[PDB]
Amino acid sequence: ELEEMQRRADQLADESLESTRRMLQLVEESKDAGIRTLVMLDEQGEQLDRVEEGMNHINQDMKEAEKNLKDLGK
Amino acid sequence: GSNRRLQQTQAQVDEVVDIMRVNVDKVLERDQKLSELDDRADALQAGASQFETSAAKLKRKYW
Amino acid sequence: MALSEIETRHSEIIKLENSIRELHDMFMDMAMLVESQGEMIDRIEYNVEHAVDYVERAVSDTKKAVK
Amino acid sequence: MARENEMDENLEQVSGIIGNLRHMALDMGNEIDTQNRQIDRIMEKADSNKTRIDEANQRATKML
Amino acid sequence: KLGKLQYSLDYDFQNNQLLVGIIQAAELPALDMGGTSDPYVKVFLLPDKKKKFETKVHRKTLNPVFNEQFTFKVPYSELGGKTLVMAVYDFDRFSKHDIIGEFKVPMNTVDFGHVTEEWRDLQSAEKEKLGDICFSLRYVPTAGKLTVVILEAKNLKKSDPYVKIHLMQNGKRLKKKKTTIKKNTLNPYYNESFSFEVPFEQIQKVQVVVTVLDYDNDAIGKVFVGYNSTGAELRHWSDMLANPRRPIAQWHTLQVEEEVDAMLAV
Amino acid sequence: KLGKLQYSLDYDFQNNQLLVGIIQAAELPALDMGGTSDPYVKVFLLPDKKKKFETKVHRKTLNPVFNEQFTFKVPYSELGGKTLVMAVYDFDRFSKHDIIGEFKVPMNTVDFGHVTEEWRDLQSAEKEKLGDICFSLRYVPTAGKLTVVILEAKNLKKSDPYVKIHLMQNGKRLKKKKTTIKKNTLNPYYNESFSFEVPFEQIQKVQVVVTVLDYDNDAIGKVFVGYNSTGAELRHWSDMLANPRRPIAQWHTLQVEEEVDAMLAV
Amino acid sequence: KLGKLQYSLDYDFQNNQLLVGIIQAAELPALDMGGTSDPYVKVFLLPDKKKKFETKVHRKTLNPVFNEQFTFKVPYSELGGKTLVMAVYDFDRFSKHDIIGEFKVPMNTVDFGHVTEEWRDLQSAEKEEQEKLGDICFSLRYVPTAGKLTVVILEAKNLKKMDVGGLSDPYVKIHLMQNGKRLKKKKTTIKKNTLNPYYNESFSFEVPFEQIQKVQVVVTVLDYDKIGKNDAIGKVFVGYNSTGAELRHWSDMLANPRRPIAQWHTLQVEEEVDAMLAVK
Ligand SMILES: [Ca+2]
Ligand SMILES: [Ca+2]
Ligand SMILES: [Ca+2]
Ligand SMILES: [Ca+2]
Ligand SMILES: [Ca+2]
Ligand SMILES: [Ca+2]
Ligand SMILES: [Ca+2]
Ligand SMILES: [Ca+2]
Ligand SMILES: [Ca+2]
Ligand SMILES: [Ca+2]
Ligand SMILES: [Ca+2]
């Protein structure tokens, strides 16, 4: 019975390591995912900036068109 | 025994988990806002096209 | 040392592993969402550019109509 | 105990990586916040310009 | 089993506005691939045309904690005619958001004077049949005896079910009978007989109305046969009339009281 | 177009037996050399093992008048579980008699109390494909977007056809979508798109089920792709998975619901 | 062609130790003047860092018989994961001893339960493995219209230990170069004692399109030291005269205007990169 118990202990001690390895894999994959995420967020940020520039341009052009229509109206 | 290391690492993981949950709910907000912006942009370009046609008519009539 | 301590440490380790797995899933989900939203932003950019063009031409015609 | 040592070596690596992941999560959050503020602003400007275009269109058709 | 929602409610008489607290949800049904849904809650008032408030979306949880508050600026005197509708929805990135479940709290039923807080089980939206009823009919024109035997009911559930039968004509309830109550069953057996006296000269101008009720009076459902009846009911009536002294047993689907009463209103 | 049969049916409660009348047939298909067939009718009950009754043979007519009656001594209470099968056969002197057509009347669907008499169009025996469905599939593992575009259907069946799509996993229906209805057509065009959100970790464990229905709900037919799928379906799934961001369009033959549901039952 | 080595293998379960026998080698090539070489054998476990055992040197023989035994005190349970290495060397009195050949025996393939003994042909030895010192991950973005060059230093991993007992204060420096000239200098913040630094720091440069094919971007990882000169861990460059994954990265950047492209890179010794940069 004693031998059995020692075998069990060695088994658990053997397992916990493997668990730590799996942890390593998971945190590595996580880090990669995080990097991809940050890159995508940067790109999309730039896209949003361009969109804002567009909105400003449209706003200004509509100011001018409004001016021309008010000039034609009076 | 490495009780301190394990508890500390565990606490770190818990913290990062909270931060990430918060961040995911935030990016979901972002998804909603982006959908709304998509629809608004579609309507915007449509109205812009219509105004282009109308303005073309005005030019053809008064120039 | 005794089997109880080894087993408790093992249990705490498995707990940590589960937590880390949750974190992993959250990062993957995050990246996924951000990507899809990236597609949405692409469409938005597209429509905005079209709007800019249309408005530009329209204001040109109004410019010439007032002359 | 060597295996135990290997296990110990790992756990520490994991800890460091978790530090990096934390910092990354924080930067991620900050940027998402900035972009949400930005998207809000964008939607306000977009609504404004939409209103302007509708008004201008109405006035343009009025003179037709 | 569409889950439960815990919420709070209090009227601020100082600022003259209704305050509603959305606390948390539990045991929500899973429709997403991953195993858990992405719940969020819309809140608003049906009488009011104003846009409904919406909580933030909680990712991958069947037990979200919202802890959010909303305010409706409505005078108390004008509040009694309005109702509050809380609806839990499932967020989806690429399609229209599916409803998880919903519930309504009529403002006119709450007895104000206290901070309200409770759990309510979510009810289904858009659907309902309420069960089926099986009974026999027999008519003997010569003797003018109309015999109705209540045989069985099924799928009753929304208990202690019982059945009441009314004989009606020209919008008037002429006779009323009722069965015994069966305890703690969704599948009661009755085999209980009732008889009415109807001369042949009037048999084509009468209605027989059968109603199933849940003992607590809340209606489970109802139906009618006879004059102005349609489908399997009219067919059952005609079959009954076609076979003097012969008993004709049949099943019927229960219908909502609004429609049956609308048909009886004529 | 296999012709039509006019028959009558009445249950004799006095003698406790079912009476069936074979009145006449019309517009029967011609397979004999001479231009007309030699029709006769077999009648019987499927639940019962007893030998089926048979009418006399009428020589060289596509419009025979039988006017014959048959009796089945079966108590009413035991009748509901049985069905009546009427089959029209073509007499031939030198070979096994070919079937012209057949039809079945389940006893449990007739609402007794009246003399029955009607014309019924003969249905084919032993066969069925029910049509074909063409749709595209696209999956983007990184974004976890699965896109299904319903393109077209053909040869629909046995009108107003519409198509319903279910996403399923482990015997559970997770999501349901449906197309618009096209009126009075056997060849509907749709071009209607639907999108689902499926993470990469689960993509090998899901099923997509597509069902075509006839609006009246009667099923026209159905099929599934994905886990436990076979043949062109499994091939289509693998092709989809092999080509990220690339759309893959394909035709599929519709299959009877029994088999598909048997495959889904696992 | 090299020659062959005969060996024996036995695990002593009574004393819990691995016994390895070096019997003899045959048909050894001959590189020494006399016509025959002076062979000796090193025997060790690859996972282990312990001092390698050696047989006696046999003078002037292409077919030496060593007949020597060595012992490794290693628990049986831990043996399956190790690999035995045996290498035949040529002794020389006045120069570095040339390797004659080597071979490896993974322990997990041996059928324990019987004494093993066989001849195995010697395979050519591996060439020298580069230090590497680590890897750096960064993104590149170029906008031709605006003439905007954006470099985001993301993170580094697996660096070289440059202070005693640890790698510390790794900090990244960026140089813009053209025709051997350093035009602009940037640097990231300093991270302390990490072999896996995270930075996420962005830098921008102004480079007209007409010159984009004639510039170099140099990225250097260094190990700071409060006192003294800061030693470089390693560096890499992209752009004009760049090669491999670097050229691929630059090309990817150019292929996607306004779009950011992130990539990993292997660090290279400063000497070689600077040698490639000094000649235009
Ligand atoms: Ca969802
Ligand atoms: Ca959902
Ligand atoms: Ca009750
Ligand atoms: Ca009750
Ligand atoms: Ca014939
Ligand atoms: Ca024939
Ligand atoms: Ca139809
Ligand atoms: Ca139809
Ligand atoms: Ca020598
Ligand atoms: Ca240092
Ligand atoms: Ca140093």
- Residue E179 contacts residue E150 (beta carbons within 8 Å): yes
Q: How far is the CA of F214 from the centre of ligand 8 (A)?
A: 6
What HEC string does E182-246 produce?
CCCCCCCEEEEEEEEECCHHHHHHCEEEEEEEECCCEEEEEEEEECCCCHHHHHHHHHHHHCCCC
Secondary-structure breakdown of chain A: helix, strand, coil percentages, each rounded to the nearest 5: 95, 0, 5
Residue of B nearest to A41 (CA): B27
What lies within 8 Å, CB to CB, of G111 at 6+ separation is: none
C14 interfaces chain F, CB cutoff of 8 Å? no
Contact by Cβ (8 Å): F117, F7 = yes
Residue F49 Cα to ligand 6 middle (Å)? 27
As given in the structure block, the two tokens for residue A46 are: 């730039």
Contact F197 E94 (CB under 8 A): yes
Of C13, C28, C45, the CB nearest to A20: C13
Euclidean distance between CA atoms C41 and C52, whole angstroms = 16
Question: Best mutation site among C5, C6, C23, C33 for testing chain D: the one with the most D CBs within 10 Å?
Answer: C23
Question: B11 touching C, CB under 8 A?
Answer: no
Q: Which two tokens stand for residue F219?
A: 């099923």
Q: Residues of chain A whose C-beta is under 8 A from some C-beta in C?
A: 5, 8-9, 12-13, 15-16, 19-20, 22-23, 26-27, 29-30, 33-34, 36-37, 40-41, 43-44, 47-48, 50-51, 54-55, 57-58, 61-62, 64-65, 68-69, 71-72
Mutate to test the interface with E, among F12, F111, F149, F196 (most CBs of E within 10 A): F111
Question: In F, which residues are within 8 Å of E60 by CB distance?
Answer: none
Q: Is B49 part of the contact surface with chain D (CB cutoff 8 Å)?
A: no
Q: How many CB atoms lie within 10 A of CB D43?
A: 17
The reply to whether A62 touches chain D by the CB within 8 Å rule is: yes
Domains of chain F: 1-126 (2.60.40.150), 127-266 (2.60.40.150)
Taking each helix axis from N to C end, the angle separating C3-65 and A2-73, rounded to the nearest 10 degrees, works out to 10
Going from the C-alpha of E149 to that of each of B35, E133, E178, F80, the distances in angstroms are: 61, 11, 12, 20
G122 alpha carbon to ligand 9 midpoint, in Å?
Answer: 20
* Dist CA E33 CA A53 (whole Å): 39
For the record, the structure tokens of B34 come out as 């982006």
Q: In this complex, is the C-beta atom of E92 within 8 Å of any C-beta atom belonging to chain C?
A: no
A-chain residues near G200 (CB < 8 A): 38
φ, ψ (nearest 5 deg) of residue G58: -105, 120
Give residue D14's domain range: 1-64
* Distance to chain B for C45, nearest Cα, Å: 8
Longest CA pairwise span in chain G (Å): 78
Torsion angle, alpha carbons of B12, B18, B24, B28, to 10: -170
This structure was determined by X-ray
DSSP state of E97: P
Domains of chain B: 1-63 (1.20.5.110)
CA F188 vs CA A28, F155, F212: distances in Å? 51, 10, 11
Give the CA-trace dihedral at C46, C49, C50, C55, to 10 degrees: 160
CATH label of the domain that carries residue D59: 1.20.5.110
Only one residue has tokens 């429509």, namely C47
Neighbors of chain F by Cβ distance (3+ pairs < 8 Å): C, E
F143 CB-near residues (< 8 Å, 6+ apart): C32, C35, C36, C39
Measured in angstroms, the resolution is 3.6
Neighbour count for residue G156 (Cβ, 10 Å): 28
| Residue D47 to residue B8, Cβ atoms within 8 A | no
C9 and chain A in contact, CB less than 8 A: yes
The secondary structure element, H or E, covering residue F193 is strand F189-197
Query: What letter represents residue A17's amino acid?
Result: L
Q: Taking CA E2 as the corner, what is the angle to CA E86 and CA E43, rounded to the nearest 5 degrees?
A: 10
Encoding tokens for residue E10? 């209090």
CA distances from F24 to F21, F45, F118, G206 (A): 9, 20, 10, 96
Interface contact C33, partner E, CB < 8 A: yes
- Residues lining ligand 9 (ion), CB within 5 A? G 32, 38, 92
- Do F178 and F164 meet the contact criterion of CB atoms below 8 Å apart? yes
Flag whether residue B25 sits within 8 Å of chain E, measured between CB atoms.
yes
What domain range is A49 assigned to?
Answer: 1-74
Classify the phi-psi angles of F71: left when phi > 0, otherwise alpha if psi is within -120 to 50, otherwise beta.
Answer: beta
CA gap E82, E50 in Å, rounded? 12
Cα dihedral: G7, G8, G11, G15 (round 10): -100
User: How far, in Å, is the centroid of ligand 2 from the Cα of C15?
Assistant: 29
**Token code pair at residue F118:** 């009607």
Burial annotation G102-127 (CB, 10 A radius, 16+ → b, else e):
bbebebeebeeeeeeeeeeebeeeee
Number of structural domains in chain D: 1
CB atoms inside a 10 Å sphere around CB F94? 4
Q: How far apart are the C-alpha atoms of E38 and E64, rounded to whole Å?
A: 9
Q: How far is Cα G142 from Cα G250, in angstroms, rounded to an integer?
A: 10
Chain E residue numbers with beta carbons less than 8 Å from the beta carbon of B30 are: none
CB E195 within 8 A of CB E145: yes
| Residue at token pair 């006769």 | F40
Q: Give the H or E element holding residue F20.
A: strand F17-26
Which residues, other chains included, contact F250 with Cβ-Cβ below 8 Å and sequence gap of 6+? Answer: F134, F135, F136, F137, F232, F236, F239
Q: What are phi and psi of D61, to 5 degrees?
A: -65, -30
Q: Any residues with CB less than 8 A from the CB of C56 and at least 6 apart, and which?
A: A61
CATH number of the domain within which A2 lies: 1.20.5.110
AA letter at G215: V
Cβ–Cβ pairs < 8 A, chains A and B = 5
The verdict on a CB contact (< 8 Å) between A42 and G259 is no
DSSP string across G27-65 = S----STTSS--EEEEEEESS--SPPEEPPPPSS-SS-E
- Chains G vs F: touching, with 3+ CB pairs under 8 Å? no
Amino acid at E239: D
Strand-strand pairing, E65-72 and E17-26:
antiparallel
B23, B25, B35, B38, best to mutate vs chain E, most E CBs in 10 Å: B25
In this structure, are residues E214 and E158 in contact, taking their beta carbons and an 8 Å threshold? yes
Contact A42 G137 (CB under 8 A): no
Q: How many domains does chain A have?
A: 1
Burial class (CB within 10 angstroms; exposed 0-12, middle 13-18, buried 19+) of D27: middle
Q: Closest to C14 (Cβ–Cβ): which among A19, A54, A71?
A: A19
Residue in C44, C60, C63 to test binding to B, most B beta-carbons within 10 Å: C44
Q: Check CB contact of F18 with chain E, cutoff 8 Å.
A: no
Taking CA atoms, A62 is separated from B51, C40, C60, F207, in Å, by: 11, 26, 11, 52
* DSSP letters spanning A32-56: HHHHHHHHHHHHHHHHHHHHHHHHH
